[PDB]
Amino acid sequence: TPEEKLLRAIFGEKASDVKDSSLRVPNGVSGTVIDVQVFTRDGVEKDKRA
Amino acid sequence: DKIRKVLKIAKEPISMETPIGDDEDSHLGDFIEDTTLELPLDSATTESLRAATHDVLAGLTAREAKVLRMRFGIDMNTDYTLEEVGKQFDVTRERIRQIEAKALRKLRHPSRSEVLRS
Amino acid sequence: ARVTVQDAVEKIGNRFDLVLVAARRARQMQVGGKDPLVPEENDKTTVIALREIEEGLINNQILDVRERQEQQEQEAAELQAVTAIAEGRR
Amino acid sequence: LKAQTKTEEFDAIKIALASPDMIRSWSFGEVKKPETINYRTFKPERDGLFCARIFGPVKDYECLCGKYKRLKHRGVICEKCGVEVTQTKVRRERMGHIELASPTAHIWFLKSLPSRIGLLLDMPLRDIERVLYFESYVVIEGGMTNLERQQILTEEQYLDALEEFGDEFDAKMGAEAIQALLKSMDLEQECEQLREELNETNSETKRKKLTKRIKLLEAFVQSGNKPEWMILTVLPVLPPDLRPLVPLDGGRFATSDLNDLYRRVINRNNRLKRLLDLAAPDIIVRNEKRMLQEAVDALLDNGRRGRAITGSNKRPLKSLADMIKGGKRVDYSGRSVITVGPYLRLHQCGLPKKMALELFKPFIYGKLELRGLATTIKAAKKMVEREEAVVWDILDEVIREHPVLLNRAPTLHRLGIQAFEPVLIEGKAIQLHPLVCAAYNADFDGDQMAVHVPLTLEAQLEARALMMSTNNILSPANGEPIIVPSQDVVLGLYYMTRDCVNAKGEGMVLTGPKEAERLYRSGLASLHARVKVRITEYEKDANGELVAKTSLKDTTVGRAILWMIVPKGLPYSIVNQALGKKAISKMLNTCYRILGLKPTVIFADQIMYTGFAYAARSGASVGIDDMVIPEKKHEIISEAEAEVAEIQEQFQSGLVTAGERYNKVIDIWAAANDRVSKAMMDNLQTETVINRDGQEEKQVSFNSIYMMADSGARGSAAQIRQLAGMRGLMAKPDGSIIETPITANFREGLNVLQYFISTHGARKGLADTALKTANSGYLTRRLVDVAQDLVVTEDDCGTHEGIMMTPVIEGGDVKEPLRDRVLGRVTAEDVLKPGTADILVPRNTLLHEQWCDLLEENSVDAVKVRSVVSCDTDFGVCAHCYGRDLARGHIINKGEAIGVIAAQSIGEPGTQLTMRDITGGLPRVADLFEARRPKEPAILAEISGIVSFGKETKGKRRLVITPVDGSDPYEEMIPKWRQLNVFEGERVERGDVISDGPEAPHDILRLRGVHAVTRYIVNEVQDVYRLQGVKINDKHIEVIVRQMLRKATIVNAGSSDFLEGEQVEYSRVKIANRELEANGKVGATYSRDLLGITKASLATESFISAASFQETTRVLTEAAVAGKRDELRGLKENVIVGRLIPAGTGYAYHQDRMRRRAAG
Amino acid sequence: HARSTGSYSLVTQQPLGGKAQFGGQRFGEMEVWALEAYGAAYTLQEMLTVKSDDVNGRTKMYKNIVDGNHQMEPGMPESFNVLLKEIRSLGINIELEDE
Amino acid sequence: QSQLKLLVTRGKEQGYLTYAEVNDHLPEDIVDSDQIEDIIQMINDMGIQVMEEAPDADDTDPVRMYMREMGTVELLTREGEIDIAKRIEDGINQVQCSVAEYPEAITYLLEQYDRVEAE
Ligand SMILES: [Mg+2]
Ligand SMILES: [Zn+2]
Ligand SMILES: [Zn+2]
Structure with missing residues (x-):
């Protein structure tokens, strides 16, 4: 929207063609991470942490 | 990968009227959320955004409010470029870009649009 | 009147009509010309109207009449523009 | 000069058949391809079920191709693809159509109980109408020779008759044949000739079908619909959004079954269109036509005939009808586990901090941006998302006087949802006032309640002036208080009485409040002695005000300090002199009736505080030595087993009837059970010895358990009797009783055998509870469905007649009086006085003026009182004729909602009703309301005459009684089975008993009278509540019986057509407007008719209201046939449309709009 | 659980979540009995329209809340508009005429 | 009854x-x-x-009612088939001959051929 285009124009665009969908701990609960795990697809660039 | 994309075309597929949790009574198509709609919160922020900008361009001069408004195309539908604005204001290109930047210089203290950013 | 609200129904029967008129007045306060009659004392517009009804002022006929005077004030005092428009299309 | 062509306010909705052109009016294009979405681009095809040009664009304002994007062209269609670029919700509202080749029969108007297309045409449904349109047996369409007009022919008969004549009686077969049939049919001329023929010399051997069809044809012709529309040639299409195919998670789309249906019908229709252009083999084309019929019928409504499958699912496809034939989630809501909150008032509830924070989100935003703090709306969001201290204070401002209404799961009555003022609590559980903890029937086993936030201004005032707990002091069912103190507090005030002799007692006198100082400073006890003090009483009379009365009464410490809580008025002291039991509620009641709301409310909070505090001070517990067993237990048990031993020995040596010795030995153990029970209670009751002055005396045990029992607080005789006494006769799965009762008790050990015996009782107890709990609501639904449309209107009408109220007396042979059934009742007219004057005409019997009905002695036990049963009102209920019984003390406010509150109050205590010449229980209540004839109905004398036998068994027959006198005879039919009660020659009155058995409500209403039948129903339905011990006012029973007698039957000659059974609504309003219109001879006399709840609820004006509960496929269809319209006064139908309810806060709106709809 | 405003189903614009918030509480027949008993016409009105499945209503009234105006400005629920289209989808025609 | x-x-x-x-x-x-x-x-x-x-x-049922009218066999043999096919060719021939009788069909074919050669 024009107003939003102007707004980012006043504070810097960086209008990346990407969105956001990161896994976040649900509001309310809170605790300690005890174990991470990653099941990669058979034919995909494995991660550093993976 | 061609086979991978091939398997993404198989099946009817599933119908919404499929029972799932077997509640009283569940339906697959009842869990499908709408996404084309915007949050009432989002719509409210958008309206307040219009008011915010409409009130920010008030603390400007005509030969600066109109410049920013017409350049980035707001409250006038079709947006114009440096030439189409430079012709209607005699001085062409660089001059109008100078003012266009000066208005942005003006917006470095107010917090309204700042918090509206996020 | 933050606990009945019973004293108001005595001044105007039918708790439903009470709700209507009280909501009417509370509407006048929340948006538009405020101006309560009974002192606020940090009470919502919901109850303020009820306090008034209990007090004896602000009823149904009262609001209607004051609305009539309101119309006679907005209309009669600014008729110069309306008449000037009346000569618009002959 | 109005005539606006926009979407403004509507006063009514109309339902009728749809012409093909009517379908075209909705058509924003024509579906022509079975294609839905693209296999690769995932883009809407050209003319498929999901077109963009026809329906609506995918994205909001950008077209299909992409020539136009932004709001520049919102009114102009695209050049490359005619796609109107507006909204995406357009895709949700746009219709569209399919135009079939050969005509198709509508499955509803075809096969839906009565064949609408058949009965309108006078032709068999699944017999002839099937074989003639399924391409099998050709039918005729009017012939002037040899052949009639609607006969059925075979192919052989067809060619034969065609050869005989032909070219002058042409008559096709199939769909278009039935079309030409309905089209050729002349509704007008037939409506005349049918009236002519079906009236000429015919008794009751024909009149049935005659009146039926003629009324049906007259209805259809006057409806406006042309029978052509019955079978459609143009089938409309449902909007795509109402049947979308949305991509789920990682591919795997999700579509509606209607897409499959429409796709099939489109395919079959297209093949048919193609076959009607290529080679046309009769078998091939006719088969494809039948297949088109299959597809269309399957799309409209599966039902019904095999069910079209496909879609891989072994389950059928959800057709259109199945999506509208047979729970409203809401925003600004939440729920949590409830917890007791003693420190609260009666108008307050504990609302969790984080919970209330999320609930009043938009309010917090607005108030934040209003004050300052947050520069903008998003700033407020970020400010509350980051809970920043100050926000909490702002929250403390927004919830101030903003009521929040709480609700429990099982909502039986109005007090299921009550409003409170939100009080922020550091916690995650919702706290509740322990006083209104009974109205919800809520316990803290782990029960959880929901909260709702009244958003609208008038919604907040509705919650404060109606649903607020402080306004719900009294129960809507019975005038008695509902927020009455329960277990804990009552045990407290019971301990604050209980006069114990001596023990730090003595009569040291003082003056009220000072006694408190005495109590805290020890020295004196608390339950002594008695002791005397100066009580300053207050009373009023005649001119009201207050009159002091200082005196010296002998109370106790507890009564003295407790007296401080008692309000200004009241008789004082004497209300405290008693104890804590049931008068604990009585005191609250009287306080309300002589003081008012506020004084009663604050009094309730004070007595709650007092009860809890002093109960805590008491510290009553339950040790193992609290439940003392009788010493005579083993004695009585041995004696009982001795007696039964002798009886068994007698049975061994014949003598006594061994066939029923089981019963008498049960009487032995039953007697023994009462012996142990009486011994235990007489022991545990008094006991004690104390030592007053010179010692030796007796009071009543301070044995904790007894204190709980003698003060409500969940502790009954039976339970205690099982604790220390013995568990009596135990039930056996057969239904019989075991002849070896549980001798032991819970204080003692329990043998494996008798426990394995008691497990049956527990099992059937829980099971039966699970049944009657759902069965209660099952009855409530019927009650509401039948009663939720009548509301007290037209202020207060005239009329004086009404059931003569009298104390329900079983005292004829058992002695049991109840004379409180008259209070808050409006008097008929000056009901006399053993002398003169007294009672006025319309004077409502006050709570103090019913106590005046005791100053007229026990002589006056009969008063005529206006009731809802009578009342010469039209479509409502006279305010006077009703009463006043509410949480409010005054009469019902004009425009309440009597129906629902009545139904609720009746079906609320259903949870505590035990299902079974005495049925008894909830089933008995159901049968009484349904007005079902008994299994052995008695008989009555219709007209007073002389009883004589009418030919001893000469039929047929079976005896015959003929009471003839004055003029004309009657021949009743007695079926030999069951005897008699009146010999020959004897005379009878109008409605005398001649069978001495169960009475039929139909006969009573039809012959005895309406007052009698209503008196019967109320006094018979109450008798099943007497046994269960559930108090419920007769008003509500009379309320449901009111519209239970809604319709009647006219028998004479008037503007109304005789045989038609119509409601006394239209009847009375039309007979009142005929005596003084043209002539009283243009109208007949009616006759009240008794019909059950279901039968009554079945009939209703609105078709939408009916489409709610009863079978939608039927009601919607028949209401479609005759151009019907709802307009639009009912509650239910005005609820699903989502508008103001014609009652309560509404009513005024409806009245204004109702009178407004008089101009045209 | 608590919900001010969240997501809605595609089929019927009724509150539902589990992805970020919690699907709103269900009213029902048992409750509309009570509200009718009280006479809470406006409470039931909102609870049946804007507060639940009124597309434009919820937004209009939400804005009126943040502006501190309350009121309502209700409208025909889609849980009845859909009923109109579904019935109209058949050979049967229903129209809501003015006066 | x-x-x-x-x-x-x-x-x-x-x-x-x-x-x-x-x-x-x-x-x-x-x-x-x-x-x-x-x-x-x-x-x-x-x-x-x-x-x-x-x-x-x-x-009562589509398929069961379809086999019904299909029940009328009227099956054929090599003689029957050839017979029917012969009637087909006979009819077609008479139609084509009837077209040959029409001179404007010939001249139109001629005109459209010159259109074909004129591209
Ligand atoms: Mg429980
Ligand atoms: Zn386009
Ligand atoms: Zn009346």
């Missing part, structure tokens, strides 16, 4: 609407999903008179 008397005399009123009873006391091929709704519609609701509307109305 049979259906009417049995249905009426039995259902008085069968108390709990005993459906699994008279549906076996009916003729024809059973286990259908068609006759079902015609019994759950009469018993209750419009009682008494509905039981009189039932008999007066009482006084």
Whole structure:
């Protein structure tokens, strides 16, 4: 929207063609991470942490 | 990968009227959320955004409010470029870009649009 | 009147009509010309109207009449523009 | 000069058949391809079920191709693809159509109980109408020779008759044949000739079908619909959004079954269109036509005939009808586990901090941006998302006087949802006032309640002036208080009485409040002695005000300090002199009736505080030595087993009837059970010895358990009797009783055998509870469905007649009086006085003026009182004729909602009703309301005459009684089975008993009278509540019986057509407007008719209201046939449309709009 | 659980979540009995329209809340508009005429 | 007679609407999903008179009804087939000859050929 285009124009665009969908701990609960795990697809660039 | 994309075309597929949790009574198509709609919160922020900008361009001069408004195309539908604005204001290109930047210089203290950013 | 609200129904029967008129007045306060009659004392517009009804002022006929005077004030005092428009299309 | 062509306010909705052109009016294009979405681009095809040009664009304002994007062209269609670029919700509202080749029969108007297309045409449904349109047996369409007009022919008969004549009686077969049939049919001329023929010399051997069809044809012709529309040639299409195919998670789309249906019908229709252009083999084309019929019928409504499958699912496809034939989630809501909150008032509830924070989100935003703090709306969001201290204070401002209404799961009555003022609590559980903890029937086993936030201004005032707990002091069912103190507090005030002799007692006198100082400073006890003090009483009379009365009464410490809580008025002291039991509620009641709301409310909070505090001070517990067993237990048990031993020995040596010795030995153990029970209670009751002055005396045990029992607080005789006494006769799965009762008790050990015996009782107890709990609501639904449309209107009408109220007396042979059934009742007219004057005409019997009905002695036990049963009102209920019984003390406010509150109050205590010449229980209540004839109905004398036998068994027959006198005879039919009660020659009155058995409500209403039948129903339905011990006012029973007698039957000659059974609504309003219109001879006399709840609820004006509960496929269809319209006064139908309810806060709106709809 | 405003189903614009918030509480027949008993016409009105499945209503009234105006400005629920289209989808025609 | 008397005399009123009873006391091929709704519609609701509307109305399948008309075999042999095919060719020939009689069909073909060669 024009107003939003102007707004980012006043504070810097960086209008990346990407969105956001990161896994976040649900509001309310809170605790300690005890174990991470990653099941990669058979034919995909494995991660550093993976 | 061609086979991978091939398997993404198989099946009817599933119908919404499929029972799932077997509640009283569940339906697959009842869990499908709408996404084309915007949050009432989002719509409210958008309206307040219009008011915010409409009130920010008030603390400007005509030969600066109109410049920013017409350049980035707001409250006038079709947006114009440096030439189409430079012709209607005699001085062409660089001059109008100078003012266009000066208005942005003006917006470095107010917090309204700042918090509206996020 | 933050606990009945019973004293108001005595001044105007039918708790439903009470709700209507009280909501009417509370509407006048929340948006538009405020101006309560009974002192606020940090009470919502919901109850303020009820306090008034209990007090004896602000009823149904009262609001209607004051609305009539309101119309006679907005209309009669600014008729110069309306008449000037009346000569618009002959 | 109005005539606006926009979407403004509507006063009514109309339902009728749809012409093909009517379908075209909705058509924003024509579906022509079975294609839905693209296999690769995932883009809407050209003319498929999901077109963009026809329906609506995918994205909001950008077209299909992409020539136009932004709001520049919102009114102009695209050049490359005619796609109107507006909204995406357009895709949700746009219709569209399919135009079939050969005509198709509508499955509803075809096969839906009565064949609408058949009965309108006078032709068999699944017999002839099937074989003639399924391409099998050709039918005729009017012939002037040899052949009639609607006969059925075979192919052989067809060619034969065609050869005989032909070219002058042409008559096709199939769909278009039935079309030409309905089209050729002349509704007008037939409506005349049918009236002519079906009236000429015919008794009751024909009149049935005659009146039926003629009324049906007259209805259809006057409806406006042309029978052509019955079978459609143009089938409309449902909007795509109402049947979308949305991509789920990682591919795997999700579509509606209607897409499959429409796709099939489109395919079959297209093949048919193609076959009607290529080679046309009769078998091939006719088969494809039948297949088109299959597809269309399957799309409209599966039902019904095999069910079209496909879609891989072994389950059928959800057709259109199945999506509208047979729970409203809401925003600004939440729920949590409830917890007791003693420190609260009666108008307050504990609302969790984080919970209330999320609930009043938009309010917090607005108030934040209003004050300052947050520069903008998003700033407020970020400010509350980051809970920043100050926000909490702002929250403390927004919830101030903003009521929040709480609700429990099982909502039986109005007090299921009550409003409170939100009080922020550091916690995650919702706290509740322990006083209104009974109205919800809520316990803290782990029960959880929901909260709702009244958003609208008038919604907040509705919650404060109606649903607020402080306004719900009294129960809507019975005038008695509902927020009455329960277990804990009552045990407290019971301990604050209980006069114990001596023990730090003595009569040291003082003056009220000072006694408190005495109590805290020890020295004196608390339950002594008695002791005397100066009580300053207050009373009023005649001119009201207050009159002091200082005196010296002998109370106790507890009564003295407790007296401080008692309000200004009241008789004082004497209300405290008693104890804590049931008068604990009585005191609250009287306080309300002589003081008012506020004084009663604050009094309730004070007595709650007092009860809890002093109960805590008491510290009553339950040790193992609290439940003392009788010493005579083993004695009585041995004696009982001795007696039964002798009886068994007698049975061994014949003598006594061994066939029923089981019963008498049960009487032995039953007697023994009462012996142990009486011994235990007489022991545990008094006991004690104390030592007053010179010692030796007796009071009543301070044995904790007894204190709980003698003060409500969940502790009954039976339970205690099982604790220390013995568990009596135990039930056996057969239904019989075991002849070896549980001798032991819970204080003692329990043998494996008798426990394995008691497990049956527990099992059937829980099971039966699970049944009657759902069965209660099952009855409530019927009650509401039948009663939720009548509301007290037209202020207060005239009329004086009404059931003569009298104390329900079983005292004829058992002695049991109840004379409180008259209070808050409006008097008929000056009901006399053993002398003169007294009672006025319309004077409502006050709570103090019913106590005046005791100053007229026990002589006056009969008063005529206006009731809802009578009342010469039209479509409502006279305010006077009703009463006043509410949480409010005054009469019902004009425009309440009597129906629902009545139904609720009746079906609320259903949870505590035990299902079974005495049925008894909830089933008995159901049968009484349904007005079902008994299994052995008695008989009555219709007209007073002389009883004589009418030919001893000469039929047929079976005896015959003929009471003839004055003029004309009657021949009743007695079926030999069951005897008699009146010999020959004897005379009878109008409605005398001649069978001495169960009475039929139909006969009573039809012959005895309406007052009698209503008196019967109320006094018979109450008798099943007497046994269960559930108090419920007769008003509500009379309320449901009111519209239970809604319709009647006219028998004479008037503007109304005789045989038609119509409601006394239209009847009375039309007979009142005929005596003084043209002539009283243009109208007949009616006759009240008794019909059950279901039968009554079945009939209703609105078709939408009916489409709610009863079978939608039927009601919607028949209401479609005759151009019907709802307009639009009912509650239910005005609820699903989502508008103001014609009652309560509404009513005024409806009245204004109702009178407004008089101009045209 | 608590919900001010969240997501809605595609089929019927009724509150539902589990992805970020919690699907709103269900009213029902048992409750509309009570509200009718009280006479809470406006409470039931909102609870049946804007507060639940009124597309434009919820937004209009939400804005009126943040502006501190309350009121309502209700409208025909889609849980009845859909009923109109579904019935109209058949050979049967229903129209809501003015006066 | 049979259906009417049995249905009426039995259902008085069968108390709990005993459906699994008279549906076996009916003729024809059973286990259908068609006759079902015609019994759950009469018993209750419009009682008494509905039981009189039932008999007066009482006084099926696509494929099964398709095999029916297909039942008319009229099968052929090599002689039959060749015969029919011969009639086809005969009819076609007479039509084409009738077209040959039409001179404007020839001249039009000529004109359109010159159009073909004119590209
Ligand atoms: Mg529980
Ligand atoms: Zn386009
Ligand atoms: Zn009356």
